[PDB]
Ligand binder design. Structure first.
Ligand SMILES: *Cc1c(COP(=O)(O)O)cnc(C)c1O
Ligand SMILES: *Cc1c(COP(=O)(O)O)cnc(C)c1O
Ligand SMILES: *Cc1c(COP(=O)(O)O)cnc(C)c1O
Ligand SMILES: *Cc1c(COP(=O)(O)O)cnc(C)c1O
Lengths: 329, 338, 331, 328
């Protein structure tokens, strides 16, 4: 394939580090070697995260098109919109953000801390609620040229390139390390993160080793979006092969009870990971994929001796909108 | 000088990046070139920050002594205690944190968001006392250390901000060195450094590190304590102790320790309108966030210094972003509309 | 019957006013005349409410027994514990409250505003279960040299817990005398049960026990219905009800308690807003908003005979509104 | 004088009760007998309070004038605005509130709990910052606005309510068989104490009305009370001039600023709540409660005096200062 055909706008410090989770691995029996790739520490732009890796490939187009405003959308504690607000500021572009409450949740400071607080400080015009279209038009009607960034960058022609590159990066680091990882655990909701990885690893025959962990609580739909985006993306990078449904793995056992709400297992995994490795995860995304990986290692689902690369996508700031649950740890 | 004599436990990703603040530099007139060295992005351990650079030199001792618990102290939104808590978990050590409201402030969620929330999730024993308790007076610090022993553990004592500790200033001497190595990879030199100062060993380490090449008075400290006299004295003292510790064959002069006092108001922990405007300006031009307590104050200082033409034209100023952003969560009302 | 046999310690201003809800009645068509009796305005003790009417008949025993501490219990935003804390302070007694997280709700300031905030200011020892509490609480008092008067949840499951509301019916009769007519029905929110229990007994006296339409807010209908029926019969015996409480005497509509105790549904919110906007009378998302929702739907469904006169008992609970701030951020 | 000349629209349950504060009185020495007239329990309209007694004299005018929308203004945790919203709904009138950031206080839920929360639930259009703007906004919208200034105070009828309060107290002193020697009342916008001064000037006790400033700008507050007392004395036919000696305003307990409590404020709120079960707030009543307690403690009240504390309301604002009371 050929990812290099598309220009990448640098928004990250460079490749993200891989760290061993020796303590957590030993805690769970030492029969499986866990590692984490820190996408959550990839940028100095408001904490970054996977979304920022996705955006490096959308910005060249936004600039080429002469757009002067980044417009996006997400739930109240969306990580995507906060990263988009930080990139706009950094790029010298205006920013319009359509925030909808996508979660059946109602904490007192939900719309004033964490991600959305940062977006307002970063200068974004945060509009709390046709939602999407009205925003885009309003920009034109005001004399601007908006660049449309769909939820999570996922349903965008370029939204899948960022993680095809992740696979690339991983091969290079694997070479450096002198070994390869057997599986990759990643949280999936809108889909272009796992889709990019599916494609990038298809290139070396490990697509079905990318273990997605649904956090949408609507697996069928999510599973479909990953499959779709992947096929489209694989076509755009000239993957010498078509992506099959068998290339897509999405575990649905840890998404409950709803998108945006943690279950007791989610909280326990967040606590265990934090307390054994000093690495925080959130109750919406990463805590769910962390919960999945921990559970997998525990049920002996990984063969003894495997090397699992947990992709930490970010999300930590949302912790602030869930303060009551964590009041005592 | 010889910092290499002291072992350093890795708690960071390695050297921290320097980035140009081109948009902000331009917005202010383009006369001064501003950059930021991102200490705020130095670690995977709960956002890390400057305190984490300091801890790298204390942990080897804690480990050699066979300590199984890290004990520290700080205000409700202390960044230090949050870093201590993550480093502890990472090392397989317990952690006890003595905390109290050290600010004349009282936001509804102050003790349940940001830094302290993370410390609890990280598994620390967060002993937050009610107002009027006065830990510093009852010396709750020592009682916590005793209770660890009492419970059969061996505590490693880490003072406020890590500063007033024999090894507390080594991390930032390392900073000056690192900066020298990057100035070489880059091919040019930084003329000044702007750093926020409260407990002092950050700026102290820098002073010792940069005196080694005649640039100590180029470290422009910006007080965030609102108690300049004490702070300046603490920095000076720590610098001299550290200088001697690393074999800096030179005295630290009063002239080597620079601490501006114009941006600390109105009190430790409380931002002024300038602080807020600085935070917003920097955030909106560079996508780089700063906080109402520490960095927003040193950002405000740097911006104001440039605006008043206090920097010689053409100067390259290296803003040291020490971290602290998680504390914004405790000041939500103030930023409710941006 | 003879309620007068049991002493009553003055904790309220006196009989509670009945106010017509003309705007709401008219807004709903005008076929049913809606009224509200203001139990929520019955006292100067931290806003009072239905529980403080119940407490007037329990305090004399507590004083009689020489107790020096009132101990009670309830959820985080419990109205009961707040009234207990205020009543205790007013009587010169200490107070210990066991508060447990009884609602699947997580709001950042849930344990720091409203009812619980007041209890702390009132001087109560507010003990939050982790995250046996009750007996440790009582014993802690004994161990301290004091003597506790145990007040169960909502003052309900206690020998005297049904008396307050028997008198409520007594009050309504005296007011109907001045009004020249009798209310056709009474709407009351029910959870621990002794409020509706006293009313059932109180109105059974003049054959209207079945006119007391309880609205379940517990989301555990069966249990609640049983607790009312049981507490009713016991109270009936305690006063002298010259009749027996039949299973047909206890009415409890289960349609408005959803989704769970302590959580409002969309109808609950509409009801709160409608009533507050047409009458300037506030209700809460846990209790009164649910009974209000019931009455409005009842009227709207033509379940009340045209021309009926319905007495909505407003039991209080408004301070809990503070624990649901996000839901009402825009009204 | 004659207040009866002016119509009053019933917004309250009727005369407010007076209660003995025996426990508190005993705690402070037993030398001074303290009571509380509960204006905070005067109405079914979202807790009411002193502002509600005022509004009873302004509503008739609004109605006569055929107004359809009540417009008022106040700080974020304003009690006045919440009462106007309640009265409004009750009268079937629209309501527009100009809520300003009048306090140097930063709390995460300050604009979402307590008084303002109620105003929104009550259907009022709550605008966060303008006065003239909102009024015009109403007209331009096709409605007729009735303007209610901050605290109902600087208004022709704004002083009538509390003249009535002195009337009520006289009638109750008659039933009790004794008279109070002083009244303690918290003052900020002024017409509450003004009405009292005029009401009690009638029987020679205007100077026994002891106002405690909570504005932290005693100068302006004292002048507003005086000016309003004069206009109001004229309106009611008081046959005397209001002298500066008739306006007592203690400045010692207002600190550090309007809307912010001091430690004495907090101590006072706790003491009163813990001895009587009567709550007070950190902006208004807690400050007047603090004042009364201190006065007693200093022996400033002659032994044997009966002091009627006027509890103006304000408790819901407690929700905006949650952190301060987290441990009691
Ligand atoms: C968006 C997001 C995800 C899920 O990524 P998708 O590409 O939308 O499936 C996981 N974790 C975090 C922290 C995110 O922001
Ligand atoms: C501790 C701290 C400072 C000040 O450093 P000192 O060594 O205590 O003077 C500045 N910024 C942040 C974010 C900090 O945590
Ligand atoms: C306790 C309570 C109820 C229900 O009364 P029970 O006697 O427990 O059935 C209803 N409303 C409010 C405001 C309450 O506090
Ligand atoms: C408005 C108010 C005051 C002060 O009354 P003024 O007539 O404005 O002097 C005191 N207490 C409370 C609770 C108030 O709402």
């Amino acid at each position: 394939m050929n990812l290099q055909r598309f220009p990448r706008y640098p928004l990250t410090f460079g490749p993200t580090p891989i760290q061993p989770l020796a303590r957590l691995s030993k805690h769970l029996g030492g029969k499986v070697h866990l590692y984490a790739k820190r996408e959550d520490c990839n940028s100095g732009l408001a904490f970054g995260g996977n979304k920022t890796r996705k955006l490096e490939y959308l910005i060249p187009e936004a600039l080429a098109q002469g757009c002067d405003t980044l417009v996006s959308i997400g739930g109240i504690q969306s990580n995507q919109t906060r990263q988009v607000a930080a990139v706009a500021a950094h790029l010298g572009m205006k920013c319009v953000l359509v925030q909808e409450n996508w979660v059946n949740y109602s904490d007192a400071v939900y719309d004033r801390v964490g991600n959305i607080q940062m977006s307002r400080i970063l200068g974004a015009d945060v509009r709390l609620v046709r939602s999407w279209e009205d925003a885009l038009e309003s920009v034109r009607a005001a004399g601007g040229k908006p660049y449309a960034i769909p939820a999570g960058c996922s349903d965008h022609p370029l939204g899948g390139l960022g993680f095809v590159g992740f696979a690339e990066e991983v091969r290079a680091q694997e070479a450096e390390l002198g070994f390869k990882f057997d599986y990759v655990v990643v949280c999936s909701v809108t889909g272009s993160t796992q889709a990019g990885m599916v494609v990038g690893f298809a290139a070396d025959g490990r697509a079905d080793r990318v273990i997605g962990v649904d956090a949408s609580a609507k697996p069928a739909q999510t599973r479909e979006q990953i499959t779709r985006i992947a096929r489209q993306t694989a076509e755009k990078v000239g993957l010498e092969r078509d992506i099959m449904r068998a290339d897509v793995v999405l575990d649905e056992r840890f998404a409950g009870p709803e998108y945006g709400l943690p279950n007791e297992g989610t909280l326990e995994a967040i606590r265990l990971c934090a307390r054994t490795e000093g690495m925080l995860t959130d109750p919406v995304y990463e805590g769910k994929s962390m919960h999945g990986m921990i559970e997998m290692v525990r049920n002996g689902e990984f063969p003894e001796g495997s090397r699992v690369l947990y992709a930490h996508l970010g999300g930590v700031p949302a912790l602030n909108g869930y303060s009551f649950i964590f009041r005592d740890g």
